[PDB]
Amino acid sequence: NSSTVAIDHSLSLAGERTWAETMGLNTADTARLNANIRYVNTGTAPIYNVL
């Protein structure tokens, strides 16, 4: 017949470096446009307030 009585102490030092990257997107609004345009008059009379 035996009887074992025990005790423990403990430390722990945990250092962590986390890198993360995320790319969100919406399928309805993927792209935005921009046009570079000129206006040409090949006619004979001038035209005003051109839209």
Added chain:
Amino acid sequence: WSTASDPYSDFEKVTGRIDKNVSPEARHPLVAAYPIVHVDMENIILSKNED
């Protein structure tokens, strides 16, 4: 003033002092002159608003 009640007088219609885009068979006073406009749909574009 307009026997066909279209927005053009009898005299303008027989004289020719009219919008020339009026068809020639509509240049008779008993012939009405009016637009008929209807829209056709060539293509659909659906976009799923999912992000």
